[PDB]
Amino acid sequence: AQYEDGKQYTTLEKPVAGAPQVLEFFSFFCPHCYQFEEVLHISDNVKKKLPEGVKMTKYHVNFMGGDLGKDLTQAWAVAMALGVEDKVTVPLFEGVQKTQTIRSASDIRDVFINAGIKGEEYDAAWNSFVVKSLVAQQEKAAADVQLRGVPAMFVNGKYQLNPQGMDTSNMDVFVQQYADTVKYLSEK
Fold this sequence. Notes:
Structural class: alpha+beta
Number of domains: 1
Number of helices: 8
CATH architecture: 3-Layer(aba) Sandwich
CATH superfamily: Glutaredoxin
Strand content: 5-15%
Order of helices and strands: EEHHEHHHHHEEH
Distance between the termini: 14 Å
Strand order of the largest sheet: 1-5-4-2-3
Number of strands: 5
Largest sheet: 5 strands, mixed
CATH topology: Glutaredoxin
Radius of gyration: 17 Å
Shape: globular
Oligomer: monomer
């Protein structure tokens, strides 16, 4: 076929019931994730090709960057609760990987403050039980699906994007192939 199991995607031996339709995992410490976000705009190009009625979910993971890694998962939970993903994603990536000015929870907080979220609003979110369960959701989703690497994308709890098998001579062509694959899997 043109799309084949084991080439543009892999199938999960152990499917996950009730998962979000399009589930993406990343880490602010993950260099390909940085590419995916700021150079390729993968999430965005996928959305643009998804049928609609389809929800996109993106979660942070713990297994990179130790203590800071966890702080970042809680901060992403804050970002999701407040709906400010689109204001902190870029400064968090660049603060971790470009300028290396993020070294403690306090520095993570500075990024939110600078993006215009109020201190009181951030600290209350940070400490809320709603953020606790949002942290729990992120961990459970990674747990359900075998996750030992990022960037990762899962479709309908059954298929896993396999980017190793798409030509990388041209970045634009890679993204489109990637996005078209998600759509195919979406319609499967």
